[model samples]
Target chain A: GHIKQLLKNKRFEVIKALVESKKIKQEWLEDLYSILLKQDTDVEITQAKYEIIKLLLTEKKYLNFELLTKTLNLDQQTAIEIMRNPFKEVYFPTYNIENPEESRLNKALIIPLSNQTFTLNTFVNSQDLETIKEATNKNFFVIFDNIFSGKSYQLAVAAGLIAKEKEILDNVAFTGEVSSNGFIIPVNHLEEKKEITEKAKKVLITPEDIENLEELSFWLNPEHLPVIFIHINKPELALQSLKQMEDAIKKDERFKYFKLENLKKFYRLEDQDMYLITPSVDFSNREELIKILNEFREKVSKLLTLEGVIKDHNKVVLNISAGISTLALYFGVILGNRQASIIYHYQKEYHKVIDLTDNPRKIKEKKSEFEKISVNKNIQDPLMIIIYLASHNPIEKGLELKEKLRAKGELIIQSKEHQGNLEIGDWSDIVSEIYTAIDDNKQKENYMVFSAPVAIMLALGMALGYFLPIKVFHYNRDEYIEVPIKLNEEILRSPF
Target chain B: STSQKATYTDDFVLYRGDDFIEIIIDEKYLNKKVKILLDNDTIFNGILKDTSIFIPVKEQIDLEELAKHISILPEG
Candidate 1:
């Protein structure tokens, strides 16, 4: 006993090295660990003890510190000192673990259209309200509007499910038909619901509609984003489902897609778990949709600018899968290069997250800012406008034709929106402008022709309006030639 | 210019313009029957050429297949 005490009194590094070299038995190291547990040590001793315990932990993988702390009757300081290291403990957010009895309900449910709350007098012994009250232990008031054909019952179901846990429903979202037995059945418009839930940036705790789940997963591209599915029948397992979700995000390398700078802005100790903000809202009404958008923007804004001192401020994972397509598009455009690369979850049957970057409005607006340069001089004769589209042999031939024959003719030189980058939005408006310009010039018996990109020319052809004849020229091997793409019968009228 | 051997290599480029898609394959692929399959479903079966084989971009290419590599058969 004296020899063991003497050995334990020795420097922790010495004891550690002795154990590592097999000079002393591991029991001796355990004894030293026990001493560190019972008494406060200097920084060096604490660090050395940490290394020894960590080594032992690897060897005895089955041994848990909680068990050790309990067996030894050690104070929390010992647990804190050891478990604080990133190597020791991995913390993840707990989901649905709160006692249903202890959960608090939001005092009032605000109506989207009126943006006002109804008092208890409005109930008038409503069946849905009575059922919701019974489902939630009658402790919370069930307030809502836009209840049509059980379409908006999802709000009640989601509210009830969340109410079974805590008041602060931060990272949770719900959707589906809420049967009286609390069985959240599947609903149509899964695609639409998925979009809003995604934009809400929450873990979608949706019904166990496995058929559409695969399609939903495919659309979400789950590999880049994470989603948690729960069975409404087993609401008791909701917390476990949430825990699994937390584990999924961590297990899936969530760090790879996030920018180092963005991560550094909030990330402190490596052991901290990421925070998820649920932005789910009912899109049954336009007002609700608008409200949801505002909520999403505000929540994401808070995430972006969250102060470091605030709790859980360091780790923020924007749930891209729970977000609306419009919101995603808005962020995709406004944030441009500033936003994080979206990561989605795909476990069961999901593929890559859908890319929604390209649009007509954004593309047209992007091009309108570019400085327009004329390729050919304007002449009094029938105008031939050659709009350069993309690079190819045909493009070269077209340019050569314009340079030789139409050098003194009116021409429109189309350039890329950003220099050296492919323009990727809708160019229909530009095509319309081209068509209208040609139509205006037709009064003088001036003919119009297009030596544009195949796509642009096709679009221009469609925009020619009903029975509007225009000669569109393309480059052949030896010369610029016109194609007889007649568009008289069933011609699509121009929108612009 | 007609006699100039097309500097076509085995590598190909897919030119997805607004209204049409041009598959610029090697010289060997020229005049060879081409079959385009998306999700293992044959969408197009036609002849390949330098100036031809242009399909109208009436529909957007399946975004799912866009991520996955396209399967093209050179022989009919």
Candidate 2:
């Protein structure tokens, strides 16, 4: 009808004005009735108004009647009547509701273990804290691992692990393997964490890993376990995800055990109980392992000198925190910052500390050139990490750490066993002998070998160290680092 | 003695008028050609002009008169 007048005039001026008058106080078309009547007495002005109103009000299913009536200058009774029976001729089409074969609403249980405050501030944040807290509060039990400590631990604390110490935490929780490039590598540990959680019945997890938490739908039980995955950053985003999960859970009866909530707090350090907790605020292995490692390194350095295992060519494979301490003290000082603590711990605790990563590929290739070099025979060159926090090539940009240590009085010895082509049996034997010799300093130290996974190795090693007489030490704290520190210090002082 | 004529279905024969010979084929890849041999010179000299190849659709149906009530026929 608005276009009808435009068809006669050939000029769209009136149509343009109406379109532009979306914010006009008075209805332009209604006002134009007198003008239309002046042109032609037969003009149906009331019919035009009704048609225009119907066009504006129809089609939009989620139409706001109150706003429309107020904007259009219509009375409340007229607006109500219009909404009740608008667009009678127009089709009020209804799309088929494709209901799922099974309902999806599942319950989740979120248990917060780590408090937020103890979490690294830069490492974690509030959004992450609340997300996980909300999930657990709603009862979504899930495994969440992430790189940032504060964000992850905050969620854990909020999940009610330390309800008494809520003040100390930042209410975030997630755990993950970290890459040197700062990528959070989420290993689907939810299934594994679930095993423990199922046994514990009230397990707390972090939301640093959203993808992994979502994957839990494949096996999670909303009835018994009630896996809760809380998300606490950017309220809208967290709510959106929570809604998606909530919708998914609601669609199936299997998700009856799922719950979602928004919890943004650093509960780990709440009520000043952070100091009382055994694990670090984040509950990550880095801090706990590092402190123990530093202590063990100092002790091993003293012991290696006493046992005469301090001599070159004898290698060691550390099985526990003491081993990492041994390597840190032996080869280098605790070089990395708080963040690097995890990397240093991983290298020492899990992987063997070879002297040479200088030519990394040579070992993987198992070159004959290296094969000739016997195990226990110290590598001529060893790989050293020189940190230049800003630029990536810190090894070249900064001074040689070993050279610096050499400048000091520390006895930093390079080993041949660092080579990859070296024989494993020979290397392991030498490492064991060195450890045994170190154990000789103490009353108990023995090597335990099992066919189980490498993860169990550290635990078994600790058990061996606790009950038995095994002085399992690593390269750094044992002989390399201490000797190098003293030797380098002493050397730097004198010309010789 | 006369040599036996090779049949198309025979293990050694794809075409007739040849002495019988058993083709060696693996159990997994039985009846499959071991290798494809083509003269490089012939392939190099060959030219493809049309570029677009058309496939004809084949259907079998009765051309007799349809049921007396309703019937459709090809006009051309």
Candidate 3:
């Protein structure tokens, strides 16, 4: 077929010198991918058959994203335009897959689109990979450089590298920006990424970049929905909405307050009178923590005046295995109102457990608008975030409050020669130096605003926060007022 | 600073005021055979007989919902 008459004589530089002399064959990469599925070529020969199918993409896997969108003609203003990775996809959200601070595998990356000025830095060099192959003309793409924030969308980096050369980008959710001719641009928080892309069941919007599609959401124009309007303009309709995601979706909604993590599965410590105390104290010996709190306040004030040895146990199952929160806030303030069962057993791999009798009340947060820095239009916009707790050498006030809260980590403690009369081994050596400085940041999201001693902030709000509405800063001098404190059972009952 | 005279006598002790609750278990599982597992269909077998096991619970609910169904099997 003389190469099908040199691709109907458009001989695209004789098939770009027979795909740069790769001594052709895999049947001439399926006859130059069937003349780029012929959509009447010429956007510079469909980017010269997308740089000869990215130099025959690792010499295999030929075509069919509906023959690469019948070779290029795409449609949809309702199809957001593309440029390259815009914050790849996050919302008013918690796409938090059991968060240890943050990461959803850098929310799927492919990014590669740059007219120069690269900021997605996950430390790259090969002079920024041959300057992203001379600015996205495409000669290879699989980049996951810890996805330095997908800042432009290029139809989610061309349907995430054609669903990584055929992979099904898990049911698909899309945002747009693809212009260099295959136009699909304009998406900024599109209705907060279409309400966190309802576990993807086809959403490739451009709907002429919505000014009003029934002013969006309520599942975008309701009534037995799943409507129709597929005339998408190229990035092969984001690889045909990430290869036609179908598994009959629409199920979601089963969080039942996330079944409060492992509420003690099974046990039996004989119906109650079992008072077992295994106390160990090495509290940097503040005189054996004032002789074990004056010998447990002289046998709990002569066993609360022995009358039926304290009216035969009302209810006080304390057990918080050693170390202190001022000895579990002095047995949670003298175990009370027939209800103060503190206990802290774990190791059924429990990582986060805060329901020590939830007091709740703090939530109602979402405030904003105070950020305004100017020198007459002096730049703005970037993203970074949380972690700090100071005072072991208030590190020059912990490096100026970790560069004014641009923080990623900081927790020093050991605050000055035991003043604030702290004991029970300086509050169990500040609760064993705060679980040996927090189980290696277990991914950081802590902040105590450091200063310590109201018995070390009442043993740092009841022996360690166990993660929470976690705020607590205070030094109102030059500035620092944050305040959210939840360490529950009403912060160990009377915490004062 | 320097104020702590020192003089405890509790092998075990618990106390609460506003209307009843006080325990003083003199230690080592007292008379033994304990089991207070409040989960997998509640269990509270009891036998620490050296005293202290009072119960009159009419109001206080939520020692974090009974310490999420507590557990402490001593001999069982």
Candidate 4:
């Protein structure tokens, strides 16, 4: 240990010149690395330890002296000769066509800093910059350093760029790869990297990874903690929701939000009193049905006052996404000219689409299990989605129309009765059922809706169109005349 | 009970209460006869009185759902 002073004082080409012709002992290399590995200062240093230990552990990991010494027993002169110069000239003259000049050992470069290091010119060759071109036609290059490697590590880098752009780099931890056009490429060894945190924080993975990781949550650590995974395919459309409710609460005393895990993606929040009420209606007759509905609406109308739907004293935010859209509508309807707004969150897809958790470290020589995806979803491809809401099944007509529209499946939501009216509240039930159905069918970019000259369509379309990107169309025998729904009227405009 | 006001437009203002829909006609249509239709079927036919009219319904109404077809036309 006292001899370490002799090592520090020596400097310069200085250092390499002293070892150009001498290495001598294997323990000298091991001891020299063990000394540096104990310094827990930088990721670059971490990379040094990883690469060095990796070489020492197994020759199967990557190419090295282990293979030269044990596997081939080659002479030392040739090994040094091959390591010194134009790698192809020495031996592997038929190496990969576009590989860097450096050998495998030298390819793993440790960092000077994020931008300070050299660039790996690969993306330029891959003409996938369609989405990124508009943002900038910049001279960007991929820099590979020590700690970052593998195919999926690029995802961590790309997603970090998004977080950085939003000025929220600290809040997001991404573990997925993305294309130049911003589509997430699915990855492996996620559990190997995902140990960074629990599901408490938002993790951006591949669009297809959410399901696989969702089930993995139970076995990964086995806790009540549900890992929140969001797949964003459209890099242009993927969001940077880097803040959490716990953090948001610190800023606004009036704001409140909830994430109900099992009910799909229904999110809600506000600062008002929320009452979940469903007074049953009697369907004795059409007149009798309307009568009860009126009473309940009025009852709900009254319940909204004073008791509060939020901390409703001031303005309130409601999640009209999961629950009945009526309550939020009714609350606002009752509010007349009150200042309140509700936002429904949704992740739109085939897209390019944070974490806050207690991450503790464990002691000594530890290791990790991981890894599937299944098929058997009785689903059809959706090129153009057709929705038929009517009393008639529309099956026969729809199948022909599906062929015409080139649609894989036509979603038919029919009334239980062949020829009866749906009472007032049945509207919500029907609308709610299709809410799930449209979600099931909305894999395409084009959407069309058909009905028996039908309120339910109007009701469904209004809310549906608000969340989903679509334009309704009507068929006049052979032509589709766009049913332009220009909601410019002040009555239907969004609250400011 | 404080009457709940909804369906505000330049033509009329609808004040909903426990059992009634109160419509105060816009000044342009005061004293003019009006027809209230739900889905093209005439639900009420009456003349505006003092710029307002009260229509009591026998059933609980979903005005928002019916709002798409709830046209208040001036009876020429």
* Predicted model with the maximum TM-score: 1
Q: Which stretch of 10 consecutive residues in model 3 chain A shows the poorest summed lDDT?
A: A259-268
> TM-scores for all candidates?
0.24, 0.17, 0.20, 0.24
Give me the overall lDDT of model 4.
Answer: 0.34
lDDT per residue as tens, model 4, A203-253: 323335333232322212222222122112233322232123223322322
Worst 10 residues of 4 chain A by lDDT: A86-95
Candidate 2 lDDT, A1-496, residue by residue in tens:
3233332443223232332233222333343322222221121332233333333444333235645455545456544544563221200001112422111111112222232211111223445544544443321112211111222232233223323222212222223332222233443334444343334333324344233333232212111222212212133344444344344444445434334431112111111110111222111234554454344344333322323312221121111122122222312222111111101112211232222212211211222232222222212222222111111222221224445433221111112444321222223222233233223222221211111122222222221232232222112111322221221222112110
- Interface Cα RMSD in Å, per prediction: 35.9, 42.0, 43.9, 43.1
Superposed on the true chain A, the predicted chain A of model 3 yields a TM-score of 0.22
Which segments of candidate 1 are over 4 A away from where they belong? A1-370, A373-375, A393-396, A399-412, A416-468, A474-481, A486-496, B1-76
The lDDT per prediction is: 0.37, 0.26, 0.34, 0.34
Using TM-score as the measure, what is the rank order of every candidate, best first?
Answer: 1, 4, 3, 2
The DockQ scores of all candidates, in the order shown, are: 0.00, 0.01, 0.00, 0.00
Where does the lowest 10-residue lDDT sum fall in candidate 1 chain A? A88-97
True-vs-predicted CA distance for residue A435, candidate 3, Å:
8.7
In order, what are the TM-scores of chain A for the candidates? 0.27, 0.19, 0.22, 0.26
DockQ-derived CAPRI band for the predicted complex in model 4: incorrect
Q: Give the lDDT of residue A105 in candidate 3.
A: 22
